[model samples]
Target: SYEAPPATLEAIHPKGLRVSVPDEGFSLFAFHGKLNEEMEGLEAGHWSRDITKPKNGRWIFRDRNAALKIGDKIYFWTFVIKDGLGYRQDNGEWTVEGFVD
Candidate 1:
């Protein structure tokens, strides 16, 4: 089985979210800003990106068309495909407060 690459959220913009990964391939990212469920917490999003390529030795998935606001809570994850299979890397969540590193 192929290994899942390490992933990170590089930036959280007023209308965008940036994801960075350590490998190259078909990658997708899912993010959502919704309320929590009963004892289940925030719902993770579906695949929001389609195809991706490497940039400076890393894979970047940037979605700058989203509608985000301050104090909004979001949940996100990184996904990749290799050899006809799919894998999800590390995931994270945050309350938006503007651009982040």
Candidate 2:
């Protein structure tokens, strides 16, 4: 197949950073943190998605305590792995928002 892994989301909240991967596409995925959208100076450890079950139709990977404030210009990126076939790809930017001060 010539398809990249499905689109994912990059989000931020008062709790931490998070991203969502569609539960049907790849094998494992990861989230790398960045202070801004500049795409360099990679500054955090990316990990495979945390849970083993699906919520709705997607797998939610939350970086609890990774981000503790809102409106901090935080961002994350994701990549997926396809077993015995392909490496993976990155999804477009996703977001997060909650009212906080």
Candidate 3:
């Protein structure tokens, strides 16, 4: 009974910037408005641990909400799912990394 499914985040925009997927029992879809990230004294330079493949989670860029402007760009990608695999053969799509005003 390892049940703790309540932490969630999803914020998505096309080229105006903002791609998010914060987690805790993570499961995102349609993908884009709530958000969470507090790994406790975290340090890994953004993110991409893919610990067992929770959508191979990564994309922790920061602009502190200035919402990029000049030739805008903000992206974050995730894919790491394989504990009996409900879906996702390490399913990944967007993998930009960072950019913001």
Candidate 4:
């Protein structure tokens, strides 16, 4: 189950979320938009999965092609869990505080 007031990304980073897992691997679900959007109330956006690595467990949400503005927001819900692994998953909400030069 997910909690209210999802995680917020206050700044931009090369690696969005770092998750470690076993040989079986795991998946990530994410949604992105501007802040003050109706994402939480409507669950409006669709989830994406194919944009992931084989099993390295490094998630980079940054869109290198495009630049993030000051008020951009990203929300995500991490599903599934691999027991006895060195990793833990949590929901996210990220806002662009600054850009990486």
Q: Candidate 1 on 16-86: residue-level lDDT in tens?
A: 66667765455443333222211123344542554456777777767766555676554655566765677
In terms of lDDT, which candidate is strongest? Answer: 1
In model 1, the Cα lDDT at residue 17 comes to 66
Candidates ranked by lDDT: 1, 2, 4, 3
Q: Which 10 consecutive residues of model 4 have the lowest summed lDDT?
A: 15-24
The clash count of every prediction, one per candidate, is 0, 0, 14, 6
Write candidate 2's Cα lDDT for 1-101 as tens digits: 55555444444444555556676655555555455454444334344443445578776777666653444454445555556454434323334445322
Query: What residue pairs clash in candidate 4, if any at all?
Result: 7-93, 8-93, 8-94, 9-93, 9-94, 9-95
Any runs in candidate 3 off by more than 4 Å, and if so which?
Answer: 1-18, 21-67, 82-101
1 or 3, greater by lDDT:
1
Candidate order by TM-score, decreasing, is 1, 2, 4, 3
Pairs of colliding residues, candidate 1? none
Cand. 4 TM to true fold: 0.41
TM-score: the better of candidates 1 and 4: 1
Evaluation by lDDT, superior candidate among 2 and 4: 2
Best-fitting candidate, scored by TM-score: 1
